[PDB]
Structure 1
């Protein structure tokens, strides 16, 4: 009897954490939210390059997509013990690659410290590759 008739598939998730991401608007000299959701470190199984990929909750829209460059440095913000700021030279969340000053904030200091640990591990992976 005849019977009735994301582009992340190439990647391993090294780390996942809930975060709020901000971009600095120098024009207004103020921090602006870019998205809240899961921040993931994805290792491409072909190139072994690790990126940050972050998607807003509800819409699943990308608010961060960039290589974790070995040259980047996580720096504290004056207001927060659970956030890092860093310059990013090429983020393609909104299409064309652009530089940003990012700040990413977590639920706790432990999460922030863990993120930094993983961020550095990924930098080291991006150096060997």
Structure 2
């Protein structure tokens, strides 16, 4: 029979308040499945490139729509290579230590955009982020 206190609102803290946006755009994210040797979908939603204002580290962060769970979260490295898929100028693949699942897990990731312009802008900013990480 005990009833319970409507818990309190907490302030919504996104974790990005210490960062600055370099890039923000909706996209579709894929994860390469090592076992089946096929791409598997990881999420659709907004990709962001963020620079910490203090450490100056720049990471890639992505959120799934509606549920707003993280589906990508890893520091961008100069060692990274963005490599378009097939002949597609709407998509790229790269290797990363991702922390979406709150665990540092190696993944090969593919990201596809709606217009080749958006993809070009993603590449451009991505590579631009590494331009300060050399």
When the two structures are superposed, what TM-score results if normalisation uses the length of structure 2?
Answer: 0.86
Q: What's 1:56 paired with?
A: 64
Does 1:99 pair with 2:91? no
Could you say which structure has the greater relative contact order, defined with CA pairs below 8 angstroms and 6 or more residues apart? 1
Q: Which runs of 4+ in 1 moved over 6 A?
A: none
Q: How does 1:25-40 map onto structure 2 within 5 Å? A: 25-40=33-48
Per-residue deviation, 1:8: 1.0
Work out which of the residue numbers 126, 129, 132 in structure 2 matches 1:122.
Answer: 129
- Counterparts of 1:116 and 1:81, CA distance in 2: 10
Q: What's 2:29 paired with?
A: 21
SS of the residue corresponding to residue 26 of structure 2 reads: strand
Q: What's 1:81 paired with?
A: 89
Task: Count matched residues.
Answer: 121
Per-residue deviation, 1:57: 0.3
Per-residue deviation, 1:96: 1.4
Per-residue deviation, 1:78: 1.3
SS of the residue corresponding to residue 21 of structure 2 reads: strand
Per-residue deviation, 1:125: 2.0
- Counterparts of 2:131 and 2:31, CA distance in 1: 25
Does 1:70 pair with 2:78? yes
SS of the residue corresponding to residue 126 of structure 1 reads: coil
1:20/1:36 contact within 8 Å kept: yes
Which whole-Å deviations, capped at 9, do the CAs of 1:79-120 have from their partners, x for residues lacking one? 6220000111x1110021011100000011111111111001
